[PDB]
Amino acid sequence: SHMPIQVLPPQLANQIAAGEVVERPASVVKELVENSLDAGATRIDIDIERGGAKLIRIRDNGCGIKKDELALALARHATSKIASLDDLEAIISLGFRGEALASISSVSRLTLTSRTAEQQEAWQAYAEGRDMNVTVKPAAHPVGTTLEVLDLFYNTPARRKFLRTEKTEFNHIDEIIRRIALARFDVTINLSHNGKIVRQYRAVPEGGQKERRLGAICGTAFLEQALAIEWQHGDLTLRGWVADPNHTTPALAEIQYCYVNGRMMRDRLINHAIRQACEDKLGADQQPAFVLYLEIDPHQVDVNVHPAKHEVRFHQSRLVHDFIYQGVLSVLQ
Amino acid sequence: SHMPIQVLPPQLANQIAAGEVVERPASVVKELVENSLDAGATRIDIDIERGGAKLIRIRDNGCGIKKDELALALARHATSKIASLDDLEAIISLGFRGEALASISSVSRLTLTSRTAEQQEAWQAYAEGRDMNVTVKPAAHPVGTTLEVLDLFYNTPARRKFLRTEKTEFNHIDEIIRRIALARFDVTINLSHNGKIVRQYRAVPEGGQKERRLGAICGTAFLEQALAIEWQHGDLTLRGWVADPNHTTPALAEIQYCYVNGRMMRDRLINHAIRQACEDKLGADQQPAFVLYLEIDPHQVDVNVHPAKHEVRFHQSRLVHDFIYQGVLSVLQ
Ligand SMILES: Nc1ncnc2c1ncn2[C@@H]1O[C@H](COP(=O)(O)OP(=O)(O)NP(=O)(O)O)[C@@H](O)[C@H]1O
Ligand SMILES: Nc1ncnc2c1ncn2[C@@H]1O[C@H](COP(=O)(O)OP(=O)(O)NP(=O)(O)O)[C@@H](O)[C@H]1O
Ligand SMILES: [K+]
Ligand SMILES: [K+]
Ligand SMILES: [Mg+2]
Ligand SMILES: [Mg+2]
């Protein structure tokens, strides 16, 4: 009771939020690329320097941000993705909290440059100070947006201590991009580190062959054991691949990617169903390898559970579990 | 780009935050009791009705809230617990985000009644509407505070669907209270459900015997196999009990409570160390039973990682793991 109850200073409030959303450089990459995706980008270029502790640049050919909404793009609780509870309960976009940019801006030097198709002029914006005041200035930029995040955690010393080696931090970025590249086969993605191109994922055209990117991302070993899945029932749909348990190695088991309505996830229920189907098919149990996609009515799933959207809750839990279990078991036979 | 980037309405913004902090009735109980603890309460009475979906009342004999800070107590990002980054990096209280009450108020009918020792008058406050406007009115109340949370999720229909049976929801509350009761032996805690007293934890006096409450909470079976631990090294300290692995059953293994600086936790590293020590001691591995407390310098741990403080990150990770491993292994021999 000694200290008065007081509203937290803008920057500090955002830094507390950043602790929950921004774990490491890879987290920044995840939030910004999901923004590019929501913006309708079909090409995304990611440039990283020193594992992301020095620089993280993401350029996309999305629709861009209007000049007079740049300050709003950096403001807390400000979003163009939802505007009501109904919008929230039926999420059709990766973002919805309106917090990512504000959180990241508070623990780094973040610059936003963008131009919409209706603008002849491009603009650049950034927030500063304890009050996070925004500056908007003239810039040169094509239709689309570029995010520049420099000196991550420069103003939050303690957090910077958790940063691993640059090789390690970059590996997590590479892994994040991997997961994203598998979520959207139709998006061209380029990734570089310290001025050197490391990844070049090419968009899979209309009804094109996805096996090409699948193998390029997960590996030929996976592609060889990959069993395509096509299971549906009403609004419930299951797609993707699952390796033959009998021919799955510890290495292949490192590939356990699942998506819910296109959003990368790591759900316990989903993993259990897949594991149960493989154990019941194979003699015993042993980490399965897979890249599965679950499509479900937005109203049947709650994605407002973790600040980084790391988890979800299914209304008809038992129904969903059984659906996936049956789907995988059906392909294994 | 069709919808404008717009700041979210106060209530909706809070509801999004509530989705991340308020999972179920037990979550509400957790946040409010931690508030009572931070306020210096030595006695806390918890009354629950219909699993918490109907009512959740928490009364404490803490220091209370001053009249002119009641509105602030319900406001977003407002706290008396920290006021700077230094405060954040050295957390010495359970709360620090300044969001719990605002989040809960947005998805329920929350009433706050309180009086400080310096006040002859008591006051009651609550927020309403899309803008969460606060009303403060006269009330009768002793020194301390009472929180009343009625009709949880009445205005967020979808979320209310996830509520389980009242017996189940209450069981989670009972479990939460269990974890809290073990964190603070010096606090008297009473818990009732539908007007019927269910739990009566009595405070353990100065240097009193903690075995009494330990057995009352965890059970005589645990108490019989419980091996006291006293391991220290600098600012690092390990206290509590660990059951003999050779005499631990699946039932006893349900007791895996760990605390970090008094805060209930469920850390992977901690659990691994304890499990590693037991496996290396016993012939094979098998879920250990324990109630352990880790005391560490606030600067060596990051508790600003999850909105509900469900996780932490240790700076010198390997050091901590080894400390716990050695501590437990030392007692097992
Ligand atoms: N690359 C981009 N292209 C176009 N608009 C963007 C881009 N990045 C961000 N925005 C806009 O900026 C707003 C702010 O982004 P952000 O702070 O990430 O919040 P969000 O995406 O709405 N929700 P969240 O991620 O859940 O916090 C979005 O709602 C978009 O309208
Ligand atoms: N039972 C109580 N007795 C005295 N003060 C209280 C009590 N409950 C809440 N408060 C006060 O109300 C403020 C608001 O509470 P709350 O919204 O829970 O935020 P917090 O405890 O500061 N942080 P957080 O829990 O991390 O969101 C606290 O900072 C206290 O100053
Ligand atoms: K924003
Ligand atoms: K508050
Ligand atoms: Mg976003
Ligand atoms: Mg609190």
Which ligand has an atom closest to residue B39 CA? 2
Most A-contacting residue of B11, B12, B16 (CB-CB within 10 A), to test interface: B16
Q: Kindly state if the Cβ of A213 falls inside 6 Å of ligand 1.
A: no
Q: Does residue A19 sit at the B interface (CB-CB below 8 Å)?
A: yes
Neighbours of A226 (CB within 10 A): 22
Chain B residue with CA closest to A85: the answer is B12
Torsion of CA B146, B151, B155, B161, to 10 degrees: 130
Identify whether the C-beta of residue B201 lies closer than 8 Å to the C-beta of residue B213: yes
C-alpha closest to that of B43 among B265, B200, B272: B200
Contact present, B32 and B22 (Cβ < 8 Å): no
CA distance B102 to chain A (A): 12
Angle ∠(A180,A184,A187) on CA atoms, nearest 5: 100
Calpha distance A35→A62 (Å, rounded): 9
The closest CB to that of B83, out of A3, A97, A161, belongs to A3
The beta-carbon neighbor of B78 closest among A6, A75, A159 is: A6
Residue of chain B minimizing CA distance to A10:
B77
**Distance of CA B257 to CAs A80, A99, A251, B183, B254, Å?**
43, 33, 34, 9, 9
Residue A133: what residue type? N
Cβ neighbours of residue B134 under 8 Å, at least 6 residues apart?
A: B70, B71, B74, B75, B125, B126, B127, B128
Please give the distance, rounded to the nearest whole angstrom, from the Cα atom of residue A157 to the centre of ligand 5. Answer: 25
**Best residue for ligand 2 mutational test, from B30, B38, B107, B143 (most atoms within 8 Å of Cβ):** B38
B306 within 8 A of B260, measured Cβ to Cβ: no
Residue with tokens 């001053």: B66
Helix (H) or strand (E) holding B211: helix B211-218
Q: Order the strands of the A290-295 sheet from edge to edge.
A: A226-233, A236-243, A290-295, A256-260, A263-265
Give the span between the Cα atoms of B311 and B168, in whole angstroms: 24
Largest CA distance in chain B: 68
Q: Is the CB of A95 under 6 A from ligand 1?
A: yes
Which ligand minimizes its atom distance to the CA of A70? Answer: 1
Between CA A1 and CA B83 the distance in angstroms is 13
Query: Using the 8-state DSSP alphabet, how is residue B120 labeled?
Result: S
Q: How far apart are CA A296 and CA A302, in angstroms?
A: 11
Tell me which residue has tokens 């229920």. Answer: A269
Cα A272 to Cα B176: distance, rounded to the nearest angstrom: 26
Are A240 and A331 in contact, with CB atoms under 8 Å apart?
Answer: no
Measured in Å, residue A144 CA sits from the centre of ligand 4 at 39
Nearest CA to ligand 2 atom 11: B73
B302 vs A3, A162, A307: nearest CB: A162
Locate tokens 């690329």: which residue?
A: A33
Please give the Cα distance from A67 to A69 (Å, whole number): 5
Whose CA is closest to B129, among B11, B14, B13, B15?
Answer: B11
Nearest chain A alpha carbon to B302: A159
**B49 vs B173: CA distance, rounded Å:** 11
Q: Which residues pair with B145 in a beta bridge?
A: B60, B114
Q: Is B327 left (phi over 0), alpha (psi -120 to 50) or beta?
A: alpha
Which one, of A19, A10, A20, A23, lies nearest residue A74 by Cα?
Answer: A10
Q: How far apart are alpha carbons B215 and B4 in whole angstroms?
A: 59
CA atoms of B296 and B301, how far apart (whole Å): 8
Residue A231 structure tokens = 């299971």
- Ligand 2: residues whose CB is within 6 Å? A 5; B 31, 35-36, 39, 60, 62-65, 73, 79-81, 95-102, 145
Q: What is the DSSP letter of A323?
A: H
**CB neighbours of A260 closer than 8 A, spacing ≥ 6?**
A267, A270, A294, A296, A301, A303, A312
Nearest atom in ligand 2 to B145's CA: 1
Q: Using H for helix, E for strand and C for coil, what is the string for A81-143?
A: CCCCHHHHHCCCCCCCCCCHHHHHHHCCEEEEEEECCCCCCEEEEEEECCCCEEEEEEECCCC
CA A123/CA A113 separation, integer angstroms = 6
User: How far is B70 from B57, CA to CA, in rounded Å?
Assistant: 18
User: Per-residue DSSP letters for A295-312?
Assistant: E--GGGEE--SSTT----
Strands lying side by side in the sheet with B144-150: B133-139, B122-128, B109-115, B144-150, B55-60, B43-49, B188-193, B196-201
Task: Collect all residues with Cβ–Cβ distance below 8 Å to A70 and sequence separation of at least 6.
Answer: A112, A114, A123, A125, A134, A136
Q: Which helix (H) or strand (E) holds B284?
A: none
Chain B interface includes A266 (CB < 8 A): no
Contacting residues of A for B64, CB less than 8 Å apart: 1
Q: How far apart are CA B158 and CA A302, in angstroms?
A: 8
CB contact under 8 A, A81 and B3: yes
- Tell me which residue of B325, B62, B303, B310 sits closest to A16, measured CA to CA: B303
Whether A106 lines ligand 1, by a CB cut-off of 6 Å, is no
> By the 8 A CB rule, do A176 and A52 touch?
no
Could you tell me the fold of the domain covering A219-332? Ribosomal Protein S5; domain 2 (3.30.230)
Cα–Cα nearest to B61, from B204, B150, B188, B192:
B188
Say which ligand is closest to the CA of A103. Answer: 1
Q: Are strands B43-49 and B188-193 parallel, antiparallel or unpaired?
A: parallel
Helices (H), A137-206: 157-160, 166-183
Resolution for this PDB entry, in angstroms? 2.0
* CA distance linking residue A89 with residue B162, whole number of Å: 13
As a whole number of angstroms, the distance between CA A67 and CA A72 comes to 10
C-alpha distances in Å from residue B173, one per residue of A138, A203, A215, B30, B178: 56, 50, 48, 8, 8
Hey, what are B301's tokens? 């741990």
Question: Helix, strand or coil for residue B152?
Answer: coil
B80 → chain A, closest CA residue: A5
Q: Do A80 and B6 touch (CB under 8 A)?
A: yes
**Portion 54-113 of B in contact with A at CB < 8 A:** 63-66, 69, 72-73, 75-85, 88-89, 96-98
Looking at beta carbons, which residues of chain B come within 8 Å of A8? 77-79, 82-83, 98
Collect all residues of chain A within an 8 Å Cβ-Cβ radius of residue B8: 77-79, 82-83, 98
Q: Parallel, antiparallel, or unpaired: how do β-strands A144-150 and A55-60 relate?
A: antiparallel
CA of B73 to the centre of ligand 6 (A): 9
Strand, helix or coil at A314?
A: strand
How far from A166 is each of A73, A105, B100, CA to CA, in Å?
Answer: 29, 21, 36
Q: How is chain A split into domains, by residue range?
A: 3-218, 219-332
Method in brief: X-ray
**Type of residue found at B189:** I
Q: Which of A247, A216, A251, A210 is nearest to A229 (CA)?
A: A210
Calculate how far, in angstroms, residue B71's C-alpha sits from the geometric centre of ligand 4.
Answer: 8
The C-alpha atoms of residue A174 and residue A180 are separated, in whole angstroms, by 10
Which residues, 6 or more positions from B164, have their beta carbon under 8 angstroms from its beta carbon?
Answer: B24, B51
What residue of A is the nearest CA neighbor of B13?
A77
A11 phi, psi to nearest 5 deg: -60, -45
Contact of A304 with A96, CB cutoff 8 Å: yes
In terms of CA atoms, which chain B residue is nearest residue A66?
A: B1
B84 touches A12 (CB < 8 A): yes
DSSP state of B202: P
What is the C-alpha separation between A235 and A160, in angstroms, rounded? 44
Mutating to test ligand 1, I would choose from A34, A35, A72 the residue with most ligand atoms within 8 A of its C-beta, which is A35
Half-sphere exposure of A317 (CA within 13 A, CB side): 11
- Given this chain, do its domains B3-218 and B219-332 carry the same CATH topology? no
Cβ–Cβ gap B77/A13 under 8 Å: yes
Give φ, ψ of B292 to 5 degrees.
-115, 150
Cα(A21)–Cα(B77) distance, integer angstroms: 16
CB A186 within 8 A of CB A178: no
What is the residue with the minimal CA distance to atom 19 of ligand 1?
Answer: A98
How far is residue A33's CA from residue A59's CA, in Å, rounded to a whole number? 9
Q: Which of A315, A313, A309 is nearest to A93 (CA)?
A: A309
- CATH number of the structural domain B3-218: 3.30.565.10
